[PDB]
Structure formats: structure tokens, C-alpha cells
């Protein structure tokens, strides 16, 4: 219970926003919002922006490590993939916001041990057809890392053993099969 020091995070993080505008190219619709590197600065940003459940369909938030843009094209994403949590419309009210926050805490908390280095970031897609949350990792052939991340993330989300989540390569998503499953 400290009195004046802030609590530094392992990494500096950038929050990005995406606004659906079909008259533009996909990457022109990405806006960098803010960056932070302490627990206090995280909460101050979180408390000052809308819950994902209140965004317009077509919008995203992404939290990525500083220097990694939330796009396949980035050098740290092009060889990577994502652990995908899919939700229907009717779970928006009940699950979206608490899953998304849990995902933020796994990122900024460095909850995957050594393998947190493989984490690039996370994305929440709010969509009329069904929302998605995912953790993007740097290298889909780092089997030990990808598998430990997904096992721990499913546990942290608190999902039943009989709901199975999948890991997709971005190369496959661009052109989806799963490389791993948990």
C-alpha cells in the first residue's frame, strides 16, 4: 500500500480506434488514441473511454505494444496469428466488456510468463453479425508459446473445457483454418 510512487508496466502500450468507413481503405480508418506505461495511466484511460458494448458496429479497439501497429502488415504481426474468441449479438451485453477487460489485464499484467514476449496485442471487433476478441501473437510457429498463451487465456476468461477456441495464422486469415485449438 504505497503512498506516492506509480506502478510501471513492463511495456508501453498504445490504444488504437478503428471507425468503419467503407469509402476509405482499411488502414486509413485506424487512429492511434493514446499511450501509457503505468497501471494508473491505464485505468485513467479506461475510465475516460466508452465500453466496447457502446461502440457503433463496425468499430474496433486495439491495444498493442508501442511500435507495433494493429495490422497484419507490421513486421511483428506478418508471421503471427491470433487466439480468437467469437461472440454472438446476444452476448454483447453480458460478456463483451468483461472479456475485453480481462484480455487487457492479461496484456498489461504480462500474464503469460516468458511467452508474453510473443504477445503483440489484442483486438475487439464490435459487429452486427457477432463480436470478436483476439490476442495477436508474433509467430505462429512458436508452438510452445502459442499453446501456453491460449491455455492461460481460456483459463483467465473462465471458459468451459467444452468450449474450444482456435488460433489462426494472419496469412490464412488474409486469403479460416485453425493452427491450434484449446
Amino acid at each position: 500500500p504505497e503512498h506516492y510512487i506509480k506502478h510501471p508496466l513492463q511495456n508501453r502500450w498504445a490504444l488504437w480506434f478503428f471507425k468503419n468507413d467503407k469509402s476509405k481503405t482499411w488502414q486509413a480508418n485506424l487512429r492511434l488514441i493514446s499511450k501509457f506505461d503505468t497501471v494508473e495511466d491505464f485505468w485513467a484511460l479506461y475510465n475516460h473511454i466508452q465500453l466496447s458494448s457502446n461502440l457503433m458496429p463496425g468499430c474496433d479497439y486495439s491495444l498493442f505494444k508501442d511500435g507495433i501497429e494493429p495490422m497484419w502488415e507490421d513486421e511483428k504481426n506478418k508471421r503471427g496469428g491470433r487466439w480468437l474468441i467469437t461472440l454472438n449479438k446476444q452476448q454483447r451485453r453480458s460478456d463483451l466488456d468483461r472479456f475485453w477487460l480481462e484480455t487487457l489485464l492479461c496484456l498489461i499484467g504480462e500474464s503469460f510468463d516468458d511467452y508474453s514476449d510473443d504477445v503483440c496485442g489484442a483486438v475487439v471487433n464490435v459487429r452486427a453479425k457477432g463480436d470478436k476478441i483476439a490476442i495477436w501473437t508474433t509467430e505462429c510457429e512458436n508452438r510452445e508459446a502459442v499453446t501456453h498463451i491460449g491455455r492461460v487465456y481460456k483459463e483467465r476468461l473462465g471458459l468451459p473445457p467444452k468450449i474450444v477456441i482456435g488460433y489462426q495464422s494472419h496469412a490464412d486469415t488474409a486469403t479460416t483454418k485453425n493452427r491450434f485449438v484449446v
Partner: peptide, 14 residues
């Protein structure tokens, strides 16, 4: 530098 869920959530409250 690592923080558990509970240590992170504590600062939201404090």
C-alpha cells in the same frame, strides 16, 4: 514486471 488480475483491479478501486 508482472501484476496479477487482482493487483491490477485493486488500483481501479483505490
Amino acid at each position: 514486471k508482472r501484476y496479477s488480475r487482482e493487483q491490477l483491479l485493486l488500483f481501479q478501486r483505490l
